Scaffold this active site. Sequence first.
Site, PDB file in Angstrom:
ATOM      1  N   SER A 129      -6.614   5.226   4.031  1.00  0.00           N
ATOM      2  CA  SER A 129      -6.493   5.424   2.489  1.00  0.00           C
ATOM      3  C   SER A 129      -7.647   6.265   1.932  1.00  0.00           C
ATOM      4  O   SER A 129      -7.903   7.345   2.390  1.00  0.00           O
ATOM      5  CB  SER A 129      -6.428   3.873   2.004  1.00  0.00           C
ATOM      6  OG  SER A 129      -5.865   4.103   0.573  1.00  0.00           O
ATOM      7  N   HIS A 171      -1.075   7.355   1.807  1.00  0.00           N
ATOM      8  CA  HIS A 171       0.170   6.485   1.151  1.00  0.00           C
ATOM      9  C   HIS A 171       1.396   7.575   0.761  1.00  0.00           C
ATOM     10  O   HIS A 171       2.040   7.441  -0.513  1.00  0.00           O
ATOM     11  CB  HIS A 171      -0.143   5.703  -0.005  1.00  0.00           C
ATOM     12  CG  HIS A 171      -1.230   4.747   0.361  1.00  0.00           C
ATOM     13  ND1 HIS A 171      -0.880   3.308   0.485  1.00  0.00           N
ATOM     14  CD2 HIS A 171      -2.701   4.534   0.356  1.00  0.00           C
ATOM     15  CE1 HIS A 171      -1.998   2.499   0.979  1.00  0.00           C
ATOM     16  NE2 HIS A 171      -3.018   3.367   0.652  1.00  0.00           N
ATOM     17  N   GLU A 198       1.973   5.637   4.854  1.00  0.00           N
ATOM     18  CA  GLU A 198       1.357   3.978   5.241  1.00  0.00           C
ATOM     19  C   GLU A 198       1.630   3.984   6.574  1.00  0.00           C
ATOM     20  O   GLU A 198       2.766   4.385   7.243  1.00  0.00           O
ATOM     21  CB  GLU A 198       1.873   3.252   4.294  1.00  0.00           C
ATOM     22  CG  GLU A 198       1.481   3.202   3.062  1.00  0.00           C
ATOM     23  CD  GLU A 198       1.960   2.258   1.951  1.00  0.00           C
ATOM     24  OE1 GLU A 198       2.665   1.269   2.431  1.00  0.00           O
ATOM     25  OE2 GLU A 198       1.412   2.191   0.774  1.00  0.00           O
TER      26      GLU A 198
END
Lengths: 266, 265
Positions: A129, A171, A198
């Site tokens: 992330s 993501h 993801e």
Amino acid sequence: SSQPAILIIGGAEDKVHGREILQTFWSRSGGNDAIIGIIPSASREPLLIGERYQTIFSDMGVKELKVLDIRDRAQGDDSGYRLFVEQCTGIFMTGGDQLRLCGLLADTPLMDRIRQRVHNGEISLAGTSAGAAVMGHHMIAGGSSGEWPNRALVDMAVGLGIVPEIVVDQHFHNRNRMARLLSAISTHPELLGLGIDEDTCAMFERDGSVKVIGQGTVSFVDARDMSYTNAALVGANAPLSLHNLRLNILVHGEVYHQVKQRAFPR
Amino acid sequence: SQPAILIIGGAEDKVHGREILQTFWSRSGGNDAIIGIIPSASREPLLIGERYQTIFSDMGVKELKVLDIRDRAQGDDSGYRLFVEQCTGIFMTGGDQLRLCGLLADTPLMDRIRQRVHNGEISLAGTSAGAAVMGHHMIAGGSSGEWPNRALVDMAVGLGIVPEIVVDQHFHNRNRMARLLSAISTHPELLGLGIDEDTCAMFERDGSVKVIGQGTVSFVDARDMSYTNAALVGANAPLSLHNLRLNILVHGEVYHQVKQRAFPR
């Protein structure tokens, strides 16, 4: 299979089942012999997120773990943390906010040394992330979806420069981030864009290959042979054109070769 | 003013310059235009028909008719079919593309519209649902926020106006690239056109495609794809697509279908 690598993880990776991505980082960090530092500085709950990964890697079986809880830049000068970085075999950067992570870590002695040891092939580095976003020299710090590409759609900043030739988004399909990635590439067309979903990872190997691991896809957006963009001509809120882009969407087991500038099947 | 096919991404400007609709008006003969409006995609055909009647009348046309087809039987109606022989342009409104095809596909009326368009006799425009029907293979529905997978997109049969393409619409506005990629994976011979709101891909008789309007048209080309896992994986599994060509165009730019190259304004 235990050679150092750089694992760029698209967020929300499996922490419960096979944990394939996290297990790969563990293996490339020396497995049962791993000495792993966890950097939770992206997060506003660093102890909780730091403990979470700690528990994951301790359960896998390692030699030593340390949470490098940098909450101010001065801790980037801390002797104890810097010593651990000399001893370590792998570093894991957690999610949170990528601007915060770079604010605390970029250009610190601690991070300079991590980067050097990664570049030297001595240790593995993973980031998920926010921790993925910081990998490039140029970084996507934020931006939206639901719009055509335009320069105002993406917030650019400076990352950690672990892999200077790329621009990471994360993501990716899950948050419909292709337009913001295209917006970034329009003015940095020399950089390979990597849009990482993801629970998916682009693993950069020492030989220049990038192996995809996990549940979704990695999008390689290549404007190096772009024939035209209106980027320099139009305002920041105006739609962008990008002509002659090459797009490679890869899944688990597939490889993108950076020297060849081409993808290959499993 | 040469006849053309305007594929419009929905929510086109109906209040200000109306550039896209004015282009359709012009290519239909302007003050001499005889335009039919097909509102069949919509469940409020009278209201949407009247909206476009007002717009085109304000521009100044010779004649308008709302071809209010609400059952397949009206596709045989001699009055509407007579109008189709007389008209210079046809406009297909938004609504639902499955509904529009269910009512119009393979009717005598639509078969003649398609033939007159192919023969270069009339212009055709479609917006939203009316754009989606343009290919032989049509995107009838599907979601966003997922990696490309076959289950992400609902494919159906369109009207085959431009059979070698697959259209998507409200494109970037609804984050539809993954569903278009999913469609192209099933049909990689088809050039994908992702058309934003208030944007238009205008297919000219010379084989060029001119982009008009506010946003972008994405030309997603898998004809030189080097590999896909599509034949090997299930419908809910992530798709790989290697060596795709992508061209994102804006107003005034042109994509040349034969040379497969885009050019700036």
